[PDB]
Amino acid sequence: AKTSMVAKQQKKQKYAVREYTRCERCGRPHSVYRKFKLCRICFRELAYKGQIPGVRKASW
Template identity: 65%
Template structure:
């Protein structure tokens, strides 16, 4: 979990649009974030397996 200051700095509007980046809404991880869900891959997998994300199921082939 990132420090509170990093989260607050991330929420502020950026001077330039290209400086904006996505963070996981649960843990604050800055990398591997799915835009559609706003979750990182770790939180996405955890919540999907728990059934907390409607319409998402594990692929099997």
């Protein structure tokens, strides 16, 4: 599921690693990150206008 597979993941299916990271307020299982706890098109909105700091679009 996706709209009902939120507790299954972030509740305790009874092993160390059966939590597979998913976007905080979403259900997308692929393209995710722990310390961001979100995804691609369930996260991007933030570094527009600054809600994520020091994010220049280019020029490393």
